[PDB]
Design a binder for this molecule. Structure first.
Ligand SMILES: CCCCCCCCCCCCO[C@@H]1O[C@H](CO)[C@@H](O[C@H]2O[C@H](CO)[C@@H](O)[C@H](O)[C@H]2O)[C@H](O)[C@H]1O
Ligand SMILES: CCCCCCCCCCCCO[C@@H]1O[C@H](CO)[C@@H](O[C@H]2O[C@H](CO)[C@@H](O)[C@H](O)[C@H]2O)[C@H](O)[C@H]1O
Ligand SMILES: CCCCCCCCCCCCO[C@@H]1O[C@H](CO)[C@@H](O[C@H]2O[C@H](CO)[C@@H](O)[C@H](O)[C@H]2O)[C@H](O)[C@H]1O
Ligand SMILES: CCCCCCCCCCCCO[C@@H]1O[C@H](CO)[C@@H](O[C@H]2O[C@H](CO)[C@@H](O)[C@H](O)[C@H]2O)[C@H](O)[C@H]1O
Ligand SMILES: CCCCCCCCCCCCO[C@@H]1O[C@H](CO)[C@@H](O[C@H]2O[C@H](CO)[C@@H](O)[C@H](O)[C@H]2O)[C@H](O)[C@H]1O
Ligand SMILES: CCCCCCCCCCCCO[C@@H]1O[C@H](CO)[C@@H](O[C@H]2O[C@H](CO)[C@@H](O)[C@H](O)[C@H]2O)[C@H](O)[C@H]1O
Ligand SMILES: CCCCCCCCCCCCO[C@@H]1O[C@H](CO)[C@@H](O[C@H]2O[C@H](CO)[C@@H](O)[C@H](O)[C@H]2O)[C@H](O)[C@H]1O
Ligand SMILES: CCCCCCCCCCCCO[C@@H]1O[C@H](CO)[C@@H](O[C@H]2O[C@H](CO)[C@@H](O)[C@H](O)[C@H]2O)[C@H](O)[C@H]1O
Ligand SMILES: CC(C)=CCC/C(C)=C/CNCCN[C@H]1[C@@H]2C[C@H]3C[C@@H](C2)C[C@@H]1C3
Ligand SMILES: NC(=O)CN(CC(=O)O)CC(=O)O
Ligand SMILES: NC(=O)CN(CC(=O)O)CC(=O)O
Length: 900
């Protein structure tokens, strides 16, 4: 619990079942990936509104009674080839027959085609308006089949290829479905751009991190298994709840980079351990206990940064939140299962194949350390003046402007609105529902119209307020229930939406009738309102949880307050820049996008994403500084320690992430660029300004005060392993007299009492040793003290031996215990026989000594104990004893049994 206890268990478990683990998980990830390629046909485009808003309710009631509008499904501009005019009866007949053929061949997809071209001899002003007055252009409407927008789009995409060939191909398709097909079509382009531009780029970066093919390929394989598995999970999620189109690229944009970053960290750690002298099995466990632990905790931070998005009612954000959680969790799991097992099978062979086969930063901190205010105050001000273009943001819905200005589908729509003005409308609606269920009378309608005319700001083309707020059209999909009537009118200024909606909702409905104010402006504004109405609580929950987790990771009261400061800074600065780029349009001409109002759900998402990004990177950096301090370093040093060995990893992690996000800034979908850029900025801001400058400078405000909590701080007693626990394993611990392998009476930790066959003689010796009537039984304490005096005796003899005193003096405390261990087992004169091996140890040639000692007869008679001691010589840690193989069936009394 709250301890490496379980990571230690899994670290050794994953090695032991390295074949089973690596087989099952790859099977599941590949199996899921195969199952996850059908996700593309089970995704939705809906989820940008508030399902519980009055505007959505108005739409449901409206569509129920009057029928959903299908006149906007497909709009098609027809233009006669040889500067001919639409009045040409011959041209009229060929095109008409072409249109009838498409409808005849696709009646499951198409309702029919409607337009002036169907009745050129009409007196209808609107129908006659479906042709330009130069008679060079005319448009038709092509209503499609389907009971929801996803089904309708699929029906469009079915008939689109043949529909595009009408009029010799000179037919321009616009409206909802051609635009929706183009907007959702951006997904595949971004995926393919990642698969071709981002993947080899990541491969190169990885190959410049490790000098080896295998070591560089492993993180890439993990990312690929993560994407496959995550998409399979999202496909499973689709069986229960709607999954948005935008969830698929998020898996690749965010999941892939994070997964590879995880793999990079763990493989890198595994190599450290190998180089430190630990064998494969131990290296695997130590990697999981440290890096695996860091990865899992990283996943928790990101999940905790994503969950608050579920407070938002937009299905768009919910799907994405599910996608992030599924990606990050799977990434963390894979890095400590498949990857660990792979390293457990490969071992040092992760560096077997190198480049041949397919072919004082450290004082810079000090500068700012000495000069904290020389760097902090300017940056602290600069990143605030970057927040000032965050006070100038606009919010809108989805339009053709989300596509680049040179996009053919966008331009077709823009030509339609140019050639045929007035046809495209976004009116506010007054949806009236009578509660009794009885018909709504003309008196009640005239009542509502009057109260609507009270509100100003609505269009009036016919210059007569009697012809304002006309009744919504009805089709054959409508129930025509008399208890529901809908009147509607458009705004003169669309930026008056939020205000005019309230005024309409301020009116008083007549005769007990529920009035629902709807329309696309209402849907957008209600969604905008819903998101900022809940943003504070989401922000509170976000900040609190991330701070609470940092209370646990740091053990400080100030540092989490400090990091919150930093994230809120790098957030507001980043979002201020994004607003400067996408709202004000700085960079628009260069990156070929249109300056426009943002989308409110993308703000909630980018807040969570930037926050979790800032928190995760600072936790890893700071947590280590903390470890150095506990290790005994100085405030200024602990910081130096921290920054320097997180350095190469953080930059290597930020870079790979930047590559992936960099592939997505080229997306034709403008909100995708907004997201990908938000990544790059906050990433760059943390990999440099925050980490290398602000943090250390804003860590010097004080020496020893940032580390402070009451006695509600980590105990970290550390059960500092000692020589007592060491030989307790090798020689046993018995509190009652027993016979060892030679049949001699022994007690405690291998302490010979006597060679007499008499038990009472041994009890005699024990009573004189402990200083009381023991009756053959001692306490653990008495055994420990007894053991100590034996250790002192062994040391005195070692220091008395001229063959052992030099090597003993040269050794660290841990390796000294290993030498004492040998003296206990075979005696000083025995240990002094290893003249060459002792010389190697004295020269700190750990590997050579370890190799040489294994060739001994001592290793032959007692391999398990010898390997334990030898490993201790190789690494200089207690690792060989803190985790050892069970058994130890034979106990034997040691040399240097001290007597009173
Ligand atoms: C772990 C890493 C890799 C992840 C890989 C994930 C594998 C995905 C699961 C394997 C395939 C599951 O198969 C799928 O399961 C669900 C069970 O609820 C079934 O779905 C069933 O339950 C839902 C519950 O409302 C019903 O709406 C549905 O009509 C019904 O058929 C699917 O018909 C089946 O096709
Ligand atoms: C992502 C952004 C999406 C952008 C969406 C842009 C789509 C624009 C859709 C334009 C809709 C044009 O739809 C067109 O409207 C007129 C009415 O106004 C219809 O005309 C219909 O109503 C008129 C009178 O109101 C009747 O006299 C006529 O008999 C009838 O056909 C046309 O049959 C239809 O083709
Ligand atoms: C990256 C993949 C993620 C998927 C991206 C989303 C693509 C699908 C949504 C594109 C269109 C947005 O959703 C759509 O917006 C337009 C206006 O905003 C609405 O269209 C409304 O306004 C237009 C004029 O502007 C009217 O002609 C039309 O009668 C009316 O319905 C649609 O009712 C709504 O369905
Ligand atoms: C060890 C294996 C390593 C690789 C494993 C990863 C497998 C998954 C990678 C590809 C993601 C799934 O496959 C993906 O599915 C959808 C539908 O099938 C495709 O995309 C399709 O629908 C999307 C939106 O729904 C459209 O934008 C696109 O025009 C269309 O082609 C993607 O272009 C394809 O990339
Ligand atoms: C129960 C509520 C809290 C449970 C989690 O408890 C928390 O777990 C993580 C990882 O195991 C520990 O985190 C520990 O390892 C990571 C690195 O791997 C460090 O960032 C952190 O400084 C260190 O303390 C926290 O110190 C502990 O407080
Ligand atoms: C601390 C633990 C961290 C790990 C948490 C893992 C995440 C799992 C939490 C799922 C929350 C429950 O998910 C529940 O179903 C859907 C999912 O969109 C939500 O969606 C709700 O509104 C949508 C509109 O889009 C409806 O289609 C849906 O019928 C409705 O349930 C609910 O508001 C939510 O209550
Ligand atoms: C992690 C920290 C998180 C930060 C905490 C965030 C709390 C900030 C709450 C501010 C509330 C802003 O409130 C919101 O402002 C914008 C304008 O700016 C309004 O938006 C309205 O005005 C703008 C400009 O005229 C229009 O483009 C937009 O279509 C319209 O809806 C919203 O209707 C309103 O709800
Ligand atoms: C050939 C040498 C390759 C390894 O050399 C290693 O490179 C990384 C560069 O990321 C350095 O690490 C440095 O990276 C970035 C540079 O932006 C600094 O923010 C970081 O604080 C610093 O530690 C290591 O200090 C160096 O030892
Ligand atoms: C998607 C939402 C809600 C937030 C963004 C999620 C993102 C990118 C966090 C940044 N952190 C991911 C990789 N971080 C890397 C990992 C390896 C190593 C040690 C840890 C873990 C810290 C660094 C260096
Ligand atoms: N482990 C040892 O020192 C064995 N030595 C024995 C010695 O140094 O006297 C022989 C050797 O190094 O080959
Ligand atoms: N492990 C035992 O029971 C006996 N041991 C001997 C010992 O621990 O001293 C054999 C060995 O370690 O190879």
């Amino acid at each position: 619990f709250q301890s490496n206890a379980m990571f230690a268990w899994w670290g050794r478990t994953v090695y032991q079942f390295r074949y089973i683990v690596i087989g099952v998980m790859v099977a599941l990830c590949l199996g899921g990936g195969v199952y996850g390629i059908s996700l593309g046909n089970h995704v939705t485009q809906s989820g940008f509104y508030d399902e519980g808003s009055q505007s959505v309710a108005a739409s449901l009631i409206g569509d129920e009674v009057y029928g959903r509008d299908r006149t906007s499904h497909v709009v098609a501009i027809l233009t006669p080839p040889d500067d001919k005019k639409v009045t040409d009866k011959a041209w009229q007949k060929k095109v008409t027959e072409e249109l009838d053929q498409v409808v005849k061949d696709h009646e499951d997809q198409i309702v029919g085609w409607v337009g002036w071209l169907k009745a050129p001899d009409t007196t209808d002003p609107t129908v006659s308006a479906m042709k330009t007055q130069d008679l060079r252009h005319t448009f038709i409407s092509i209503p499609l089949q389907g009971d929801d927008d996803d089904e309708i789009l699929k029906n469009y995409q079915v008939v689109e290829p043949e529909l595009q060939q009408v009029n010799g191909g000179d037919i321009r398709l616009a409206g909802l479905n051609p635009l929706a097909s183009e907007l959702t079509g951006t997904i595949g382009e971004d995926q393919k751009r990642a698969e071709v531009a981002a993947i080899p780029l990541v491969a190169v970066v990885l190959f410049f991190v490790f000098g080896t093919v295998i070591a560089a390929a492993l993180p890439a394989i993990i990312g690929g298994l993560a994407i496959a598995g995550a998409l399979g999970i999202m496909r499973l999620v689709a069986e229960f709840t709607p999954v948005h189109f935008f969830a698929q690229p998020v898996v690749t944009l965010i999941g892939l980079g994070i997964a590879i970053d995880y793999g990079l960290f763990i493989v890198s750690r595994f190599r450290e351990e190998i180089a430190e002298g630990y064998d494969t099995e131990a290296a695997v466990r130590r990697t999981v206990m440290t890096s695996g632990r860091t990865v899992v905790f990283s996943a928790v931070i990101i999940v905790a940064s994503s969950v608050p998005l579920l407070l938002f009612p937009q299905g768009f954000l919910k799907s994405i939140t599910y996608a992030i959680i599924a990606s990050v969790m799977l990434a963390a799991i894979l890095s400590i299962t498949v990857l660990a097992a792979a390293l457990a099978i490969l071992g040092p062979r992760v560096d077997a194949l190198g480049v041949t086969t397919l072919l004082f930063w450290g004082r810079l901190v000090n500068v700012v350390m000495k000069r904290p205010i020389a760097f902090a105050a300017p940056i602290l001000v600069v990143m605030v003046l970057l927040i000032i273009p965050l006070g100038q943001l606009s919010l809108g819905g989805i339009s053709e402007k989300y596509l680049p200005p040179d996009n053919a589908v966008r331009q077709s729509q823009e030509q339609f609105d140019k050639l045929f003005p007035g046809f495209r409308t976004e009116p506010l609606t007054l949806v009236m529902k009578r509660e009794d269920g009885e018909p709504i009378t003309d008196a009640q309608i005239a009542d509502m119209r009057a109260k609507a005319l009270t509100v100003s700001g609505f269009t009036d083309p016919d210059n007569d307020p009697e012809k304002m707020w006309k009744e919504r059209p009805a089709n054959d999909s409508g129930s025509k229930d008399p208890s529901v009537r809908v009147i509607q009118n458009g705004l003169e200024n669309r930026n008056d939406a939020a205000k005019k909606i309230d005024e309409l909702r301020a009116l008083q409905p007549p005769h007990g009738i529920e009035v629902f104010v709807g329309g696309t402006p209402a849907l957008e504004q209600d969604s905008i309102h819903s998101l900022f109405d809940k943003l504070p609580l989401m922000a509170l929950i976000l900040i609190v949880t991330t701070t609470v987790l940092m209370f646990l990771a740091f053990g400080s009261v100030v540092l989490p307050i400090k990091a919150a400061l930093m994230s809120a800074l790098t957030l507001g600065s980043t979002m201020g820049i994004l607003t400067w780029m996408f709202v004000d349009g700085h960079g628009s001409g260069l990156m070929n996008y249109t300056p426009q109002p943002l989308m409110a759900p993308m703000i909630g998402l980018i807040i969570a994403v930037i926050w979790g990004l800032s928190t995760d990177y600072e936790v890893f950096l700071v947590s280590r500084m903390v470890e150095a301090r506990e290790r005994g370093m100085s405030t200024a040093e602990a910081i130096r320690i921290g920054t320097a060995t997180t350095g190469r990893l953080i930059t290597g992690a930020a870079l790979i992430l930047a590559v992936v996000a960099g592939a997505f800034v080229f997306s034709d979908l403008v909100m995708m660029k907004y997201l990908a850029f938000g990544l790059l900025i906050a990433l760059l801001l943390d990999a440099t300004i925050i980490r290398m400058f602000l943090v250390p400078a804003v860590m010097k405000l004080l020496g020893d005060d940032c580390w402070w909590a009451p006695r509600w701080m980590k105990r970290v007693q550390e059960k500092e392993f000692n020589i007592f626990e060491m030989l307790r394993i090798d020689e046993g611990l018995r509190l009652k007299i027993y016979k060892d392998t030679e049949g001699y009476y022994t007690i405690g930790i291998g302490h010979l009492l006597t060679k007499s066959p008499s038990l009472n003689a041994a009890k005699s010796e024990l009573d004189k040793a402990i200083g009381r009537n023991t009756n053959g039984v001692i306490t653990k304490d008495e055994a420990e003290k007894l053991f100590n005096q034996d250790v002192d005796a062994a040391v005195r003899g070692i220091l008395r031996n001229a063959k052992l005193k030099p090597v003993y003096d040269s050794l660290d405390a841990v390796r000294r215990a290993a030498l004492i261990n040998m003296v206990f087992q075979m005696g000083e004169t025995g240990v002094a026989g290893f003249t060459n091996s002792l010389r190697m140890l004295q020269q700190k040639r750990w590997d050579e000594a370890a190799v040489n000692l294994a060739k001994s007869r001592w290793y032959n008679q007692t391999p398990n104990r010898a390997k334990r001691v030898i490993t201790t010589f190789r690494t200089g840690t207690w690792d060989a004893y803190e985790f050892h193989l069970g058994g130890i069936k034979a106990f034997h009394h040691h040399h240097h049994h001290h007597h009173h």
